Amino acid sequence: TVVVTTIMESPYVMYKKNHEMFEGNDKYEGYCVDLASEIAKHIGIKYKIAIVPDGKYGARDADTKIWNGMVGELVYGKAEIAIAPLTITLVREEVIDFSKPFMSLGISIMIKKGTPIESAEDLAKQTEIAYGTVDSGSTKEFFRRSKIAVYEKMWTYMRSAEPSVFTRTTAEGVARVRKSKGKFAFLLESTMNEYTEQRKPCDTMKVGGNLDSKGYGVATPKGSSLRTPVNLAVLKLSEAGVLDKLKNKWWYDKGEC
Amino acid sequence: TVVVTTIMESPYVMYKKNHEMFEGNDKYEGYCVDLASEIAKHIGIKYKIAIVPDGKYGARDADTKIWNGMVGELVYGKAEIAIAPLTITLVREEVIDFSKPFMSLGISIMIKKGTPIESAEDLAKQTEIAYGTVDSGSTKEFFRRSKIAVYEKMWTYMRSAEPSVFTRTTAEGVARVRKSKGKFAFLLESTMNEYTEQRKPCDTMKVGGNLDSKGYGVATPKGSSLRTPVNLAVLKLSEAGVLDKLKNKWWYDKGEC
Ligand SMILES: N[C@@H](CCC(=O)O)C(=O)O
Ligand SMILES: N[C@@H](CCC(=O)O)C(=O)O
C-alpha cells in the first residue's frame, strides 16, 4: 500500500461532510482525491492518504538544511508519492522528481472587492494596504529570489513587516483579506484565487495578470519505480480531457457566486 | 558539438534579414535561437543548429512505425537535442525525454477577421467554412484521439474532407486562412495564433478559448547525459523571468498591429 502525502487545501483535498463517520481515504473529497484515484487505477496500486503532519508544502531550512512539509515526507521516506497542488521548482527538482504538470498556474493577487489595487506595481508603490503570502511554499520563495524591481520592493516590505504578513495556511490568508476591509491583499496561486472567487460570501476577486507561469506536478522520491508510470498516467489523463473535467467539477460546477 | 534539431517556425526560428551572408547558427534568430543560447550557456555546451530535413514536428507512421520530423531526428540519433515548439505528449514521451515546459499553450481557432465563428461548436455545426490542422503534429493527433463529441464531429469531417484540409506547415495553414475569404479556419496552438494576430496585414485573429492545456519541452533522446542539466536549465530560466522576457521580445515587442 502506497503512502500518499497531501495537504488540506480547498478544493484539492477537503473533509467530506460528516467526515468523522468515514474511515481512511473515505474521509476526504476533492480534485486531488479524484486525481489520486485516477492515477492509482492507471498504474495499479493500493494507496493510503496521509495528510502532511506539519501542514506545509515544503521548504528547506537554511539553518539545519532539513526539508519540511510534503517535500520532507518524500525526502525522508515517510511517503511514496505526493498528490497535491505542489509547484514544480528548481530547488525541489534537485531533491525529488515531478511528473509533467497536471495543472498550469501562476502567482496572483487576491483583494477584497473594491480595493484600489489592480497590479503588483500598485501594491509596491503604496503602504496603506498590507499584503503577504503563505509560509513554506513556492510563492514566498518567488519573492525572496526575485531580481525584478517590483517584486524586490514587495519582498523587502514583506520580509520586515510587523505584525507578520506571512500566514501558516492559504485559508488564513483568505480570512485575513475578508476581515481587513480592503487593507490586506494576499499573494497566492491563480488556481486557489479563482476557486475562492466562486465561493460564498463572494467578497474576493483576482486582479491583474499572473506574476509567473508554472505547474503542479505529482511528486515521487528519487529512485522511485513509480516515476515513469506516474508521468505517463498524468499525460494520459491530460490528453483524455479528464484533468479539464476534474477542474470544472471542483471549481465551477460547484460555483456559488 | 551538440546537434540541435529545430524547425523553421515564426517567431521561434526564422532567417535573419540577409541570412545568406551569415554562417552556421548566425543565419538564424528567434525565441528558440535565444533559448538555445541560454541553455548552452547554463549547461556548458557547443552546439550547431540543424533545421529538420523533412520540415515536420514529428509523428509515427501507423504503417512503417518510423518516426518523422524532429522526433525522428532524436529517435534515430541524427540530433542530440530538440529546441523548438515541440509539444509534450504521451506518445512522444514513450520514445524521447522532455524537460518541464518552457511555454504553456493550447489548441486554438484562427479565422480571417469577420468570419462568423467564435467556437469549436460553431465550426462543427456548419459546413460552409472549411477547417484543418497541420500534418504530423500534436494538433492533428488531438482530434484523431478525442472522445469529446464536438471534437469527434470535427475529426470525422476533417479526416474525409476533399480537397485536403491538412497542411504541410503552419505557414501554409495561415496563408490558406488569409486567401480564402472567411471560408477556411485553421486549428493551431495559441502561441502561433497569438503571434500571427500581431503581424501585418493584421487580417487574422484567435477566437474562443483554448481547447486544451499543455506545454512545449526541450527534448533529448532516451539515455542522454543532457537530460537533467537541460531540465534544470529550463527551470532556472523560468524562475529568473527569462522565458517571460523572451516571449515579450518575440511576440509583443515585435507587434505590428
Ligand atoms: N503550490 C505552492 C503552495 C502555495 C503557495 O506558495 O502559493 C507550493 O507548492 O509551495
Ligand atoms: N507544437 C506542435 C506542432 C504544431 C501542431 O501540431 O499544432 C507539435 O509539437 O507537434
- Judge whether A120 and A154 are in contact, CB under 8 Å: yes
Residue nearest (by alpha carbon) to ligand 2 atom 4: B137
Q: Is residue A87 within 6 Å of ligand 1 at its C-beta?
A: yes
Burial-class residue B206 by CB neighbours within 10 Å (0-12, 13-18, 19+): middle
C-alpha cell at B239: 524562475
Ligand 2: list residues with CB < 6 Å: B 57, 85-87, 134, 137-139, 188-189
Q: What ligand 2 atom has the least distance to the C-alpha of B188?
A: 7
Burial-class residue B100 by CB neighbours within 10 Å (0-12, 13-18, 19+): buried
Instruction: Select the residue of A94, A212, A239 nearest B145 (Cβ to Cβ).
Output: A239
Sequential DSSP letters for A26-95:
GGEESHHHHHHHHHHHHHT--EEEEE-TT-----B-TTT--B-HHHHHHHTTS-SEE-SS-B--HHHHTT
Instruction: Select the residue of B93, B94, B232 nearest A90 (Cβ to Cβ).
Output: B232
- Judge whether A108 and A206 are in contact, CB under 8 Å: yes
**Residues in chain B closer than 8 A to A231 (CB atoms):** 93
CA dist A254 and B231 (Å) reads: 37
What is the set of domains in chain A, with CATH numbers? 1-105+215-254 (3.40.190.10), 106-214 (3.40.190.10)
CB of A236 within 8 Å of any CB in chain B?
yes
Q: Which residue, A115, A130, A209, A118, is CA-closest to A173?
A: A130
Going through chain A in order, the beta strands assigned E by DSSP cover 2-6, 14-15, 28-29, 47-51, 81-82, 96-98, 103-105, 107-112, 130-132, 184-189, 204-207, 214-216, 219-221
Q: Is B119 annotated as a binding residue?
A: no
Residue nearest (by alpha carbon) to ligand 2 atom 10: B137
CB count in 10 Å sphere of residue B156: 12
CB of A223 within 8 Å of any CB in chain B?
no
CB contact under 8 A, A238 and B214: yes
**Residues in chain A closer than 8 A to B94 (CB atoms):** 232
> If you measure CA to CA, which chain A residue comes closest to B94?
A232
Tell which phi-psi region holds residue B23, choosing left (phi > 0), alpha (psi between -120 and 50) or beta.
Answer: beta
Technique that determined the structure:
X-ray
Q: Is B169 annotated as a binding residue?
A: no
Tell which phi-psi region holds residue B93, choosing left (phi > 0), alpha (psi between -120 and 50) or beta.
Answer: alpha
Integer Rg of chain B from CA: 18
Residue found by looking up cell 505557414 in the block: B171
Q: Which residue, A213, A59, A214, is CA-closest to A133?
A: A59
CA dist A172 and A11 (Å) reads: 15
CA dist A144 and A33 (Å) reads: 32
CB count in 10 Å sphere of residue B203: 15
* Contacts with B149 (C-beta within 8 Å, 6 or more apart), sequence order: none
C-alpha cell at B86: 515541440
- Judge whether B212 and B124 are in contact, CB under 8 Å: no
Q: Which residue, B87, B145, B155, is CA-closest to B120?
A: B155
Residue found by looking up cell 515541440 in the block: B86
**Residues in chain A closer than 8 A to B104 (CB atoms):** 104, 213, 215
CA dist A122 and A209 (Å) reads: 13
- Judge whether B142 and B190 are in contact, CB under 8 Å: no
Q: What ligand 1 atom has the least distance to the C-alpha of A86?
A: 9
Q: What is the resolution of this structure in A?
A: 1.9
Q: Is B138 annotated as a binding residue?
A: yes
CA dist A83 and B163 (Å) reads: 47
Q: Is residue A79 within 6 Å of ligand 1 at its C-beta?
A: no
CB of A150 within 8 Å of any CB in chain B?
no
Q: B134: CA distance to ligand 1 center in Å?
A: 37
Burial-class residue B234 by CB neighbours within 10 Å (0-12, 13-18, 19+): buried
Please give the angle made by the CA atoms of B217, B89 and B134, to the nearest 5 degrees: 90
Q: Is residue A138 within 6 Å of ligand 1 at its C-beta?
A: yes
> Mutate which of B86, B239, B244, B245 to test chain A, going by most A C-beta atoms within 10 A?
B239
- CA–CA min distance B90, chain A (Å): 6
Residue found by looking up cell 508544502 in the block: A57
- Judge whether B5 and B78 are in contact, CB under 8 Å: yes
